Structures are given as structure tokens and as C-alpha cells.
Ligand binder design. Structure first.
Ligand code: 0XA
Length: 380
């Protein structure tokens, strides 16, 4: 249960989430569970499905307790429905503890489970305010903290790592071997999603020049369950215009910028240097101070592994328009060590031990930056 024994406890397939091994029930039933900072329900496949290798069999668990209540969660992509109950849960490569937690037993779903993803359930790590059916359903992490001495903090090192990816979820603390340089903290604005505030956006150091509330219209969040960086429409359009300008020595079809169509180069020849760096400036812990996190094209051009196209390297543009605020998804978290410091209501970013670099540019977390304008960047 030591932090070192938690290193490398995550696996995934690119664009399909990262998952940790758990057990549910007595005796323990092993399942792989997607780690989601963008939701707050713990839910597991509990009936057969074409894409599930295995599923939770409540009838084999003596500790299962039925709560006699249904529950439905509609995600941005995918949805499921099922029955609530509680059971014992453990994380074999997490802390050394067993807790009783709410579990939604999924009995019907649509476009939620993913063919070949290797996971069978979801661990929503965000706060009760966004749990279904309502905020009286205590989330898993709340139960863990209440029932054990685990400190109220976890960290995620998602590695873009050949379709297979890895990383680490450190429960209850911060493992200094997983990052270099300083950790910079941004405040959690409200405990529902992991809501943060972006104060500035640059593309190859050119400010997008918008009122900073636009960046957080109508919230900005850190979400390991969404793949892409998602940007409010107005911000999205300004960003795409600036990235197109920076990369204009090559022209790509509209479908590529819509994040729908692949772009392919002969293997080993991807022209990284024509694509700009994106800087996201996060509110700091002191008034009108910020820090920035810098994203390279190796993070926002997501490779799509496919043997059939493997004479080439092919990528999707991993930035999408949103109508529900900014989503700093997995492609933004990859190569940073991200500390979800619930105890101190803040989120820490540092350059990860698995960072993106090439011979010219390196992903960075740096600061402080000061801004003269006294405007509050929070929208809501
Ligand atoms: C646009 C989008 C893409 C994808 C998933 C998603 C979206 C997606 O919806 N991911 C899920 C994550 O919980 C979504 N988080 C936000 C956007 C905050 C959200 N929307 C709705 C909610 C409530 C739960 C509060 C009702 O929260 C997690 O799903 C499992 C992850 C699978 C891997 C990513 C697969 C993917 O391609």
C-alpha cells in the first residue's frame, strides 16, 4: 500500500480512458475501473454485454446490500442505468484498505462500454454535488476518506506511452518520483466538478485576446474521463484560427479541424515543428497571479493506432468545441502530474516524469505571471 507500490497502477488504450484494478464484493470480484475526475458515481457492469469481458455478480457477494433505488447517468458521451446498493471495495495496487461504498450495478447502457477497452466500470472521483440521483449518494472517495486514515488527496500521472498506455494513481499523497520541478496550484472554485479558472490562453505565445470570462464560459474543469481539450465555441474558433495560421505551410481538410478525420504522414515524418505550442494560464493562489501549463502538438494531435494504416502515423486533432465550458481532458493531463488536493481545495500541476519533449520544445508548468487588469475571470 506504499506510494511506490501504487506506481504504475493504471493502464489504458489511447482515447479510451485509464483504468485501475479494483475488487468488489465478498469474496472479491476483480474488475478494471476507469478513473474519472469528471463524474461522481462508482458504477460497474452487472450484466452481460458484448463489450464486457466480465461483470459484477451481486448474487455471489454476501456483503452486497440492495438500496432499492434505480439510478441513470447520462454522460457527455454514453449513458447507463442500473440499481443502487453498497458493497465492500478494495484497490489491490492502491492503499491497503477495504471500504464499504455505494455501487451502481449497471444493467442497461448505450454507447458507454467501448469494444476492447479492458475496463468494466467507472470510478467517479469528483464531488457529491454532481452524483446521480442526487448529492446524498456519497461518492467513493468520500467513503474511503471517512472510513480510513487515507489523507484527503489523490494524484494522477497519465502517461501517453503500442495502443497501450499506463500511469499512476497515488491515493492519499504525492510521490516526488513522478514529477520534476515545482508543483503550481490553482484553486478549486467550487466542489462539484473539479472546477478551475483559466485566465489567459496563448498559441505560440500570442494571446487570444478575449475577455477572460469567455475561457470559463460557463465553467472550466479537469476531467480524466474526457479525451480531448474542449473549448467554449468562441475560444475554440479563435484557437483553431491561430493554430491554422501557425501551421499554414500545410493545409488540412475541414474534417480534421472538426476532430473527426485523420491526418497521416509517412511513418516517422510527422512535422511537429509546424504546429504551435498552446499555453493555458491557470488562476494562482494569490490575487492576479497565475502560472501556465504548456501543451505541445504531441499532446493535442492524438495518434490513432491501426495496423491497417501503419505505413503512416495518423492522428486526430484532440481539441473540440464545447457548449458546456472548457474541459481539460486527458490529452491535457498527459505528461503532467496532477494533484487533486481536496484537503486544501486546490489542484497542483507539475511536469511529469513521463513528459512530452522533442529535441526542440518541452511541455512546462511555470510561473508566476501577473496581470494588471482586475477583472474576475470566473463566469458563473
Ligand atoms: C466527448 C467525450 C468523449 C469520451 C467520453 C466522454 C465525452 C464522457 O462523457 N466521459 C465521461 C465523463 O464523466 C464526462 N465528464 C463530463 C464532461 C464532466 C460530464 N458529462 C456528463 C457528466 C455527469 C456525469 C455530471 C452527468 O459529466 C466518462 O465516460 C467514460 C470515459 C470513457 C473514455 C473517453 C471516451 C470518449 O471518447
Amino acid at each position: 500500500g506504499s506510494f511506490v507500490e501504487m506506481v504504475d497502477n493504471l493502464r489504458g488504450k489511447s482515447g479510451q480512458g485509464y483504468y485501475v484494478e479494483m475488487t468488489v464484493g465478498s469474496p472479491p470480484q476483480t474488475l478494471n475501473i476507469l478513473v474519472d475526475t469528471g463524474s461522481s458515481n462508482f458504477a460497474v457492469g452487472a450484466a452481460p454485454h458484448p463489450f464486457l469481458h466480465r461483470y459484477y455478480q451481486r448474487q455471489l457477494s454476501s456483503t452486497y446490500r440492495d438500496l432499492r433505488k434505480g439510478v441513470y447517468v447520462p454522460y457527455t458521451q454514453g449513458k447507463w442505468e442500473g440499481e443502487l446498493g453498497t458493497d465492500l471495495v478494495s484497490i489491490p495496487h492502491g492503499p491497503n484498505v477495504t471500504v464499504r461504498a455505494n455501487i451502481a450495478a449497471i444493467t442497461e447502457s448505450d454507447k458507454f462500454f467501448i469494444n476492447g477497452s479492458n475496463w468494466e466500470g467507472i470510478l467517479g472521483l469528483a464531488y457529491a454535488e454532481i452524483a446521480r440521483p442526487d448529492d446524498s449518494l456519497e461518492p467513493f472517495f468520500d467513503s474511503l476518506v471517512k472510513q480510513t486514515h487515507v489523507p484527503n488527496l489523490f494524484s494522477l500521472q497519465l502517461c501517453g506511452a503500442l495502443a497501450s498506455v499506463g500511469g499512476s494513481m497515488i491515493i492519499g499523497g504525492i510521490d516526488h518520483s513522478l514529477y520534476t520541478g515545482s508543483l503550481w496550484y490553482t484553486p478549486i472554485r467550487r466542489e462539484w466538478y473539479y472546477e478551475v479558472i483559466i485566465v489567459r490562453v496563448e498559441i505560440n505565445g500570442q494571446d487570444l485576446k478575449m475577455d477572460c470570462k469567455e475561457y470559463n464560459y460557463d465553467k472550466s474543469i479537469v476531467d480524466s474521463g474526457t479525451t480531448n481539450l474542449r473549448l467554449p465555441k468562441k475560444v475554440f474558433e479563435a484557437a483553431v484560427k491561430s493554430i491554422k495560421a501557425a501551421s499554414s505551410t500545410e493545409k488540412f481538410p475541414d474534417g480534421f479541424w472538426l476532430g473527426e478525420q485523420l491526418v497521416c504522414w509517412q511513418a516517422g515524418t510527422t512535422p511537429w515543428n509546424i504546429f504551435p505550442v498552446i499555453s493555458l494560464y491557470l488562476m494562482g493562489e494569490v490575487t492576479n497571479q497565475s502560472f501556465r501549463i504548456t501543451i505541445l502538438p504531441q499532446q493535442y494531435l492524438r495518434p490513432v493506432e491501426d495496423v491497417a494504416t501503419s505505413q503512416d502515423d495518423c492522428y486526430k486533432f484532440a481539441i473540440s468545441q464545447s457548449s458546456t465550458g472548457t474541459v481539460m481532458g486527458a490529452v491535457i493531463m498527459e505528461g503532467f502530474y496532477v494533484v487533486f488536493d481536496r484537503a486544501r481545495k486546490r489542484i497542483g500541476f507539475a511536469v511529469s516524469a513521463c513528459h512530452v519533449h522533442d529535441e526542440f520544445r518541452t511541455a512546462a508548468v511555470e510561473g508566476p505571471f501577473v496581470t494588471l487588469d482586475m477583472e474576475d475571470c470566473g463566469y458563473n
